[PDB]
Amino acid sequence: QVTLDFFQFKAEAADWFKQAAQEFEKENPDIRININNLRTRFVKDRVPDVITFNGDYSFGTFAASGVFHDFTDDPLVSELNEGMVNIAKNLVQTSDPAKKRLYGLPFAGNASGYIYNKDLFRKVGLDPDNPPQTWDEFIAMLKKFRDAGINPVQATLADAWTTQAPLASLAGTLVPESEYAALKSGDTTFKQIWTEPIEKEIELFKYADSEKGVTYQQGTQNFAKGTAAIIPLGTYAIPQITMVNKDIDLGFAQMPATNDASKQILTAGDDVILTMGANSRHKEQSMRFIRFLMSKKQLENYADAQSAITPLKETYFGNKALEPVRPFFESNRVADFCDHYIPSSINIGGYLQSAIMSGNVNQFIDSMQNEWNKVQA
Ligand SMILES: OC[C@H]1O[C@H](OC[C@H]2O[C@H](O[C@]3(CO)O[C@H](CO)[C@@H](O)[C@@H]3O)[C@H](O)[C@@H](O)[C@@H]2O)[C@H](O)[C@@H](O)[C@H]1O
Ligand SMILES: [Cl-]
Numbered sequence: 163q164v165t166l167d168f169f170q171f172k173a174e175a176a177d178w179f180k181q182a183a184q185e186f187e188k189e190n191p192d193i194r195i196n197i198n199n200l201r202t203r204f205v206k207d208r209v210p211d212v213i214t215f216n217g218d219y220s221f222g223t224f225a226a227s228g229v230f231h232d233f234t235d236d237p238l239v240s241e242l243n244e245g246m247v248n249i250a251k252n253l254v255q256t257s258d259p260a261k262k263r264l265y266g267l268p269f270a271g272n273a274s275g276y277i278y279n280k281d282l283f284r285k286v287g288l289d290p291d292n293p294p295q296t297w298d299e300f301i302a303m304l305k306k307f308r309d310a311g312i313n314p315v316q317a318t319l320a321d322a323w324t325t326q327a328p329l330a331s332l333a334g335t336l337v338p339e340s341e342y343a344a345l346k347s348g349d350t351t352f353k354q355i356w357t358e359p360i361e362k363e364i365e366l367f368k369y370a371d372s373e374k375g376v377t378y379q380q381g382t383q384n385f386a387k388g389t390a391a392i393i394p395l396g397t398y399a400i401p402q403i404t405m406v407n408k409d410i411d412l413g414f415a416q417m418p419a420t421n422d423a424s425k426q427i428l429t430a431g432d433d434v435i436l437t438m439g440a441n442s443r444h445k446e447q448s449m450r451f452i453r454f455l456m457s458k459k460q461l462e463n464y465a466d467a468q469s470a471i472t473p474l475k476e477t478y479f480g481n482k483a484l485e486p487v488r489p490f491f492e493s494n495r496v497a498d499f500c501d502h503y504i505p506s507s508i509n510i511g512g513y514l515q516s517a518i519m520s521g522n523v524n525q526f527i528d529s530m531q532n533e534w535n536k537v538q539a
């Protein structure tokens with residue numbers, strides 16, 4: 163009989179993981195799973211046995227420091243979407259190509275863009291199956307909502323991380339990931355690469371016609387209750403909206419950053435990486451649970467509950483709301499999040515909140531650059 167500590171990062175999926183653990187326990191009487199919904203928590207001697215983490219810079223730093231088990235050879239890997247596996251490997255924060263190993267399993271994918279209310283689209287005569295293809299059309303849509311008496315955009319600025327979503331959506335098209343290597347070597351600057359994304363994010367939030375400084379929970383509640391045409395968050399937010407209102411008719415769309423309709427890109431990443439503490443005392447039992455979670459049945463059950471994208475080679479989309487972005491995935495017109503290249507020590511969320519509210523692009527760009535420069539030094 164062993165007790166596993168399961169650190170589960172994702173607020174929106176707390177019940178799903180609680181129930182999955184309980185199901186596993188019923189079938190495996192020799193294993194109890196204690197869920198806790200960060201370096202201190204991840205000291206070797208107390209590292210959780212099973213872990214979910216967002217696939218971001220922080221994951222990559224813990225991976226490079228040896229906190230997580232090395233899954234590179236694991237028999238599970240060959241049934242997974244190679245792009246999602248490669249994203250996880252490329253997050254490892256190392257300058258040595260050979261050290262870009264696999265330190266967790268992609269469990270679920272996301273995309274960043276905007277969630278929209280199809281009934282409000284219908285109300286103003288827009289086609290909810292064919293959202294805007296260009297920046298100009300996207301802005302014209304927001305203006306159409308305002309002119310019809312509808313709040314175009316629900317902001318959630320009181321939760322700073324939410325301001326990263328539009329930046330990442332827009333940067334996906336505007337800024338190739340290769341620019342971050344040039345940024346590190348000093349061959350480009352934030353002024354050159356992020357001025358246009360931040361200007362467009364500021365423009366987007368000029369169409370937030372209600373109070374901007376509300377919380378994530380408040381914004382998703384407002385949206386669920388029909389009071390805004392769009393909420394510019396990624397797919398991870400869908401379950402939070404639908405739990406408030408089962409009946410809301412939602413779509414998810416790419417946020418078009420330019421007027422080149424043929425060269426739009428969808429920001430998409432590894433929303434959940436499932437891993438094991440490298441210094442776990444109970445690796446065999448931990449892996450039994452991980453194998454249970456990584457079965458197609460469980461992955462698809464999760465994807466349905468959470469409106470996510472499964473990590474299997476045959477991709478499954480958990481919600482018909484995701485139909486407008488299916489072509490980006492099919493054509494591989496995707497990009498990882500721009501903020502996965504930004505060290506966790508830089509307070510990008512706080513700088514973005516300030517930029518959106520104040521409009522002061524120069525201060526935002528200078529803050530990012532000066533903090534980046536010091537890290538690279
Ligand atoms: O654009 C926002 C964000 O999207 C991706 O992360 C999705 C992740 O965001 C939220 O999780 C928290 C909420 O505090 O935010 C960090 C990630 O920034 C997570 O550690 C934390 O749990 C949602 O609540 C989650 O459901 C969702 O999975 C992207 O990877 C991030 O870099 C960032 O751009
Ligand atoms: Cl594949």
Ligand SMILES: [Cl-]
Pocket residue numbers: 477478479480
């Ligand atoms: Cl599907």
Ligand SMILES: [Mg+2]
Pocket residue numbers: 167208209210211
């Ligand atoms: Mg423990």
Ligand SMILES: [Mg+2]
Pocket residue numbers: 173174402
């Ligand atoms: Mg919740």
Ligand SMILES: [Mg+2]
Pocket residue numbers: 259
């Ligand atoms: Mg490489």
Ligand SMILES: [Mg+2]
Pocket residue numbers: 296298299421
């Ligand atoms: Mg046009």
Ligand SMILES: [Mg+2]
Pocket residue numbers: 308309311312
């Ligand atoms: Mg009005």
Ligand SMILES: [Mg+2]
Pocket residue numbers: 338339496497
């Ligand atoms: Mg690219």
Ligand SMILES: [Mg+2]
Pocket residue numbers: 370371
């Ligand atoms: Mg106003």
